[PDB]
Design a protein around this ligand. Structure first.
Ligand code: SAH
Ligand code: A1IQR
Length: 258
């Protein structure tokens, strides 16, 4: 009763996802209100709080880079990961500054604004491109998410809008949190942002299953998985009716218990 893993390889259109959720158009859409809030939290986590280190692993990056714009100010290296090779190719297109890459300029500008206008768009983009060295395949459902590929234990593991889409049930969800912890150094940071109580999301006519969790189930799973929560925020803002049936989104910062 849940989207098969292999559907992500074939039917998740990276460009269409970017057009539908991250175009950041002139009209005050629900998608843009969500994106602005996620950016505020990411700015607060990486620039205001002490979330820093040599390595940050982004889990289930999809074709997006918005979740890394503040992070590149605090981590020497950022490793981007996704189950879809098609998604990693779209990421790589932006990373190499190709002309057919997605235009992130209204999002890049917004981040520079948030950060105190210390830098401009081109300088911001360059710091991120220099931070990303590895573009890897990952599967959160596996005990070794990065498979046979080795990495030093991360200082931080970030995952935006991935676990609800990747986990068919609550046992898999708690298991995936434990699997992300195996990529984390003891006492390392876990940053998760996702939808609340969503049973699906859409990319045009293409439907994708989502695990509908309430904030209590998310908190319980993080505790069961061996983390300690530092903060937890719920926003009431949901996606447009045509996109998903969520009841807001959550953001949390936790630490791996040694
Ligand atoms: N088992 C799995 N392991 C890892 N990534 C998975 C996965 N199942 C789905 N995904 C990925 O999870 C993503 C959900 S969309 C979220 C994309 C991006 N992080 C953002 O914030 O918009 C897709 O890129 C999909 O390919
Ligand atoms: N992974 C997602 N990407 C787009 C928005 C969304 C809404 C609800 C559940 C999942 C998602």
């Amino acid at each position: 009763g849940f989207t098969s893993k292999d559907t992500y390889l074939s039917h998740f259109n990276p460009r269409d996802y970017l057009e539908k959720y991250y175009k950041f158009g002139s009209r005050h859409s629900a998608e843009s209100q969500i994106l602005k809030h996620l950016l505020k939290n990411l700015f607060k986590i990486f620039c205001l709080d002490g979330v820093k280190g040599d390595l940050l692993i982004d889990i289930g990056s999809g074709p997006t880079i918005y979740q890394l714009l503040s992070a590149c100010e605090s981590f020497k290296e950022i490793v981007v990961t996704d189950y879809s090779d098609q998604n990693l190719q779209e990421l790589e297109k932006w990373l190499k500054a190709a002309p057919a890459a997605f235009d992130w300029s209204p999002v890049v500008t917004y981040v520079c604004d948030l950060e105190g206008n210390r830098v401009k768009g081109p300088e911001k983009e360059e710091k991120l491109r220099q931070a990303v060295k590895q573009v890897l395949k990952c599967d959160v459902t596996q005990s070794q998410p990065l498979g046979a590929v080795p990495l030093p234990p991360a200082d931080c593991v970030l995952s935006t809008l991935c676990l609800d889409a990747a986990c068919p049930d609550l046992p898999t969800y708690c298991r995936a949190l434990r699997n992300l912890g195996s990529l984390l150094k003891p006492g390392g940071f876990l940053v998760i942002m996702d939808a609340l109580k969503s049973s699906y999301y859409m990319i045009g006519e293409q439907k994708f299953s989502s695990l509908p969790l309430g904030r209590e189930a998310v908190e319980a799973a993080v505790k069961e998985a061996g983390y300690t929560i530092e903060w937890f925020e719920v926003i009431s803002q949901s996606y447009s009716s045509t996109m998903a049936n969520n009841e807001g989104l959550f953001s949390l910062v936790a630490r791996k218990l040694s």
